[PDB]
Design a protein around this ligand. Structure first.
Ligand SMILES: [Mg+2]
Lengths: 278, 298
């Protein structure tokens, strides 16, 4: 009756509280969820500090299944949604549940229909990684978006650098983030096509990280991948010297931080790369 | 204690769907097809499959198959290869795969293979070896494995074999237990287990340690598929698994003293069945199903 109409107004109201939150502040570092069992009368569940916005826990308990069900009504063709409605419901669903695959697929259909800007999904997905750095679907969707932007140009090289920064942060929020590194590798293979210029800059930029983040077998695999690619791209750069420098860099870390087995196995693989050129 | 009583475990699974958390299972609705298969496969392992509502599940699965043949994780969701596998696995337990359109599922899976032999998750073309396994497993249970180019499929998976002896999602990616479980299972169905170094990979799995029962099951199941399972201590692990139990509610968590879920509860029950448990049905490491189900008459 009226209750089903009241919640329709309430949900429509709170999604604009987030929309106007991004408008008052484009720069939003992260997304959080503040604990609040019951609602306050004259208070909106959307709380915004200088660069972070949070949502009271009561809001998600009541309104999340409403937005969730409304998207399913669109997919079953029982209740159509507008352009702005679709980009609002998916945005809210993925800001709370990034692994909602169907919600991502909706934005895909909008992106290449000229409905949604692909750059927004890069910004949207970037926010989701600040809360869920492991979320597979967020990475999976991002790869799809990146394939739509390129299909190296200046914009292409700018794009890759952006992906490198979000692969560095996602690797910092959790050690050995497989999905965050496997995505970084995917970028080099498809968006860079193993361009030797980028590969060299990646080796130089991951030196400091490798020093700090020992016992990170995922991060060191990226190191091994850079070297293996540079070898494959040459069938200018002193290729044996890179293996000379790597085995020495590995030793200096062992001397400094002994007992780390992943670090030891890394150097063991560099040895294999040296015997391969023989 | 050291008690291996499963009566209170079966009660936990059956009474887990009675808890009024209208919001909680609303966020996990993108997994509920697999989530159902999970809870179902251990009730079958404990001989308590009859405590789960079969009729309401059969209707749910039929309502999840789309016109393209694919199957969603839930009604209204987009069809994916992952939850196409789960649905098929369920229907296999109930001796009723003819509930859904068998041909369209085959057609759907077949049309997800690329020219390099790889498989995509959905029509949006995400490449992973998990989908290679999901494809071959689904077709195996359907008896239509030759409906795809097996040669190129095997070729792509072998190309994901890293120097560690392990496997990754895509060629060049890091070796991971989850990917190994898929690829080993892939080679197991395609009768290409000789292609992998049983000794080298076995040494990798036993050495590697960290949802952690994902990781735990993926190691245990793979070693069983490999044939080099004995390289790990059975008894020491069994008691450790019994510690992950919940004496009050039931089920298994990832670590002793954590929240228990139907998912980790499986490989708690399923893991023990690999270790050599008598009170639990012999579980298959590849399909994660009771071995009894994998044998039909007609
Ligand atoms: Mg049977």
């Amino acid at each position: 009756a009226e209750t089903s109409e009241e919640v329709a107004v309430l949900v429509q109201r709170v999604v604009k509280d987030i929309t106007n939150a991004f408008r008052r502040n484009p720069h939003i570092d992260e997304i959080g969820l503040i604990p609040c069992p019951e609602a306050r009368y004259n208070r909106s569940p959307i709380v915004l500090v200088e660069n972070k916005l949070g949502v009271e826990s009561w809001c998600v308990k009541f309104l999340l299944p409403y937005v969730h069900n409304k998207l399913l009504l669109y997919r079953t063709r029982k209740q159509w949604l507008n352009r702005d409605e679709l980009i609002d419901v998916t945005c809210t669903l993925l800001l709370l549940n990034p692994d909602f695959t169907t919600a991502w697929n909706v934005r895909k259909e909008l992106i290449l229909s000229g409905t949604l800007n692909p750059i927004k999904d890069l910004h949207l997905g970037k926010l989701a990684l600040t809360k869920f750095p492991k979320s597979p679907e967020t990475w999976i969707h991002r790869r799809w978006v990146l394939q739509q932007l390129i299909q190296p140009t200046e914009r292409a090289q700018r794009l890759i650098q952006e992906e490198m920064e979000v692969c560095g942060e996602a690797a910092g929020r959790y050690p050995s983030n497989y999905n965050a590194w496997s995505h970084r590798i995917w970028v080099l293979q498809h968006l860079a096509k193993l361009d030797v210029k980028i590969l060299l800059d990646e080796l130089s930029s991951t030196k400091h990280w490798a020093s700090m983040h020992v016992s990170d077998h995922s991060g060191f695999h990226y190191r091994q991948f850079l070297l293996k690619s540079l070898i494959s791209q040459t069938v200018r750069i002193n290729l044996p010297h890179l293996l000379e420098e790597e085995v020495e860099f590995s030793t200096d870390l062992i001397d400094s931080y002994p007992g780390h087995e992943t670090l030891w196995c890394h150097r063991r693989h560099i040895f294999y790369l040296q015997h391969h050129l023989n | 204690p050291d008690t291996l009583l499963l009566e209170k475990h079966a009660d936990y699974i059956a009474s887990y769907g009675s808890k009024k958390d209208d919001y909680e299972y609303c966020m996990s609705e993108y997994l509920r097809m697999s989530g159902i298969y999970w809870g179902l496969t251990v009730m079958d392992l404990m001989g308590q499959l009859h405590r789960m509502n079969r009729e309401e599940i059969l209707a749910f699965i039929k309502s999840c198959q789309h016109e393209c043949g694919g199957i969603s994780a839930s009604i209204g969701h987009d069809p994916h290869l992952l939850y196409t596998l789960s649905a098929v696995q369920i229907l296999t337990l109930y001796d009723s795969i003819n509930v859904i359109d068998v041909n369209k599922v085959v057609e759907y899976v077949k049309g997800l293979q690329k020219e390099d032999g790889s498989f995509a998750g959905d029509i949006w073309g995400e490449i992973d070896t998990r989908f290679s396994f999901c494809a071959v497993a689904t077709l195996a249970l359907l008896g239509k494995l030759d409906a795809i180019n097996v040669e190129k499929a095997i070729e792509f998976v072998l190309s994901c074999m890293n120097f560690d002896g392990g496997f990754g999602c895509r060629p060049g990616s890091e070796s991971h237990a989850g990917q190994i479980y898929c690829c080993t299972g892939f080679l197991a169905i395609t009768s290409q287990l000789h292609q992998v170094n049983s000794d080298l990979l076995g040494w990798w799995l036993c050495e590697r340690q960290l949802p952690d029962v994902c990781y735990s099951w993926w190691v245990l199941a793979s070693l069983k598929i490999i044939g080099r399972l004995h390289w790990i201590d059975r008894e020491k692990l069994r008691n450790f698994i019994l510690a992950c139990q919940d004496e009050e509610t039931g089920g298994f968590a990832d670590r002793p003293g954590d929240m228990v879920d139907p998912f980790h509860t499986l490989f708690g029950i399923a893991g023990l069945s690999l270790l050599g448990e008598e009170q639990i049905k012999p579980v298959n490491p590849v399909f994660c199903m009771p071995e009894e189900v994998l044998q039909r008459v007609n």
